[PDB]
RNA sequence: AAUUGAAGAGUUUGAUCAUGGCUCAGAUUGAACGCUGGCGGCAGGCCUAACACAUGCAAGUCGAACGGUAACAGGAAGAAG
């Protein structure tokens, strides 16, 4: 129902006097499949720990997705930490044609015909917030005619 | 009707985010090499020595331009078998 999709799981260290205690991070996206998607960090001492953390801090950080039939409005760009994220709406592109940890992103929002490219850092955590911050600053032809032009037969003509 | 088209990954660190190279997955070739090998179709086939070349062939034709008769096949005569 809502789509909890594992995007990557790493090994990160502390340092301690003893020796170096390690721990597992998680990165898990959630989204219902219609324009809600959201995702959680989560982190914790075993695997199973840090993903289940990860669901539950995706859950309460979901946003609004405008999307016209499965794709986008228009093409839009993303930029968080030196990850520069471009996305077309692809009128038929018939495919998810996006990269690691930008596909499983957009998979559980609900799009399904994407053109798309990460320039900059791929780093996975930073590409996700790239992307986010990219779909909810994209406006429908709903809003933008709600604020300009004042008729949506003569906002896109 | 005459285009509908854009994926990333590995590796600097105890771990991190950046920067930045290296490398890989793709397609292609007048290809070569290794192993293997049934048929057909359509193409392609000295990229190096514009190095050197045995032998054959690759530009002849026209008698309705002309003098002609070296052959060839007949005819016309002359003989004689």
Do not use: C, W
Request: charged share 20%.
């Amino acid at each position: 129902e809502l789509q909890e999709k594992l995007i990557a799981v790493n090994r990160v260290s502390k340092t301690v006097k003893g020796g170096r205690i390690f721990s597992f991070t998680a990165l898990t996206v959630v989204g219902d499949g219609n324009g809600r998607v959201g995702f959680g960090y989560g982190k914790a001492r075993e695997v199973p720990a840090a993903i289940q953390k990860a669901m539950e801090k995706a859950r309460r950080n979901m946003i609004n997705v405008a999307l016209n039939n499965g794709t986008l409005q228009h093409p839009v760009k993303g930029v968080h930490t030196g990850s520069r994220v471009f996305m077309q709406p692809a009128s038929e592109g018939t495919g998810i044609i996006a990269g690691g940890a930008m596909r499983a992103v957009l998979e559980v929002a609900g799009v399904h015909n994407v053109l798309a490219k990460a320039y900059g850092s791929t780093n996975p955590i930073n590409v996700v917030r790239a992307t986010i911050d990219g779909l909810e600053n994209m406006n429908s032809p709903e809003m933008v005619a709600a604020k300009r032009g004042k008729s949506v037969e003569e906002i896109l003509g």
